[PDB]
A paper describes a structure:
RV is a non-enveloped double-stranded RNA (dsRNA) virus with three concentric capsid layers encapsidating eleven dsRNA segments. The outermost layer contains the glycoprotein VP7 and the protease-sensitive spike protein VP4, which define the classification of RVs into G and P genotypes, respectively. RVs use the VP8* domain of the spike protein VP4 to recognize specific host glycans in a genotype-dependent manner. Our studies show that VP8* of these genotypes engages the type I precursor glycan (Galβ1,3-GlcNAc) at a unique and conserved binding site that is present in all P, P and P HRVs, and the subtle sequence and structural changes lead to an altered glycan configuration at the reducing end in the neonate-specific P RV, that may play a key role in the age-restricted tropism of some P strains.
The structure of the neonate-specific P VP8* has not been determined previously. To examine whether the VP8* structure of P differs from that of other HRV genotypes including P, P, P, and P, and whether it can bind glycans as observed in P and P, we first determined the crystal structure of VP8* of a neonate-specific P HRV strain RV3 at 2.0 Å resolution. Similar to other VP8* structures, the P VP8* has a β-sandwich galectin fold with a distinct cleft between the two twisted β-sheets. The cleft in the P VP8* is noticeably wider compared to that observed in the VP8* of P HRV, but similar to that observed in the VP8* of other HRV genotypes including P, P, and P. Comparative analysis with the glycan bound structures of P and P VP8*s shows how sequence variations in the P VP8* leads to the loss of A-type HBGA binding observed with P VP8* and how interaction with type I glycans in P VP8* is unlikely to be similar to that observed in P VP8*. The sidechain of R101 in P, which makes a strong hydrogen bond interaction through its side chain with A-type HBGA, is substituted by isoleucine in P which cannot make such an interaction; the hydrophobic residue Y188, which is crucial for stabilizing A-type glycan in P VP8*, is replaced by a hydrophilic amino acid D186 in the P VP8*. The residue R187 involved in direct hydrogen bonds with Gal of LNT in P VP8* is replaced by T184 in P VP8*. The residues Y156 and W178, which provide hydrophobic interaction with LNT in P VP8*, are changed to T156 and H177, respectively. The J-K loop that interacts with LNT in P VP8* projects away in the PVP8* structure. These observations indicate that the neonate-specific P VP8* cannot bind LNT at the same site as P VP8* and likely has a distinct site for type I glycan binding.
Numbering used by the authors: 65 to 223
Amino acid sequence: LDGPYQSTSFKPPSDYWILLNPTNQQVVLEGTNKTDIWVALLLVEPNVTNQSRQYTLFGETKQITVENNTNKWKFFEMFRSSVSAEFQHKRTLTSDTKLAGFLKHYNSVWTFHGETPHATTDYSSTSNLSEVETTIHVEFYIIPRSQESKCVEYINTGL
């Protein structure tokens, strides 16, 4: 919808879907309010044998075991609620579209999980939504939640 945005660090306005358009395996998003929510989406290329890859998350060097036995791409949703904790593999988006989503809405942070073309949304709660800031490493678009059905379309079948 709103055309290609270059990679940047910003606090997205609420009720707007950020639609990430990555090309290469990567840490594609880091989002936190530095209080009770840390979210990171790691893009894993197709046909990846179980192995521990090194990622930089919020200035910290982390080893994360990744695996992708499919021809599709997988977005690893790493999550922690306290800065002192280690990241957990909370959800996964298995995709042939290579698009992912990020939305701030009603005290929660919404992402997509499942497998295309049947990927669905889920959320994580936070006590300070307004202060969650995202470092989008890749090109992205912005779609309002008043057109969320369009963003579901793109997530599952592409732009």
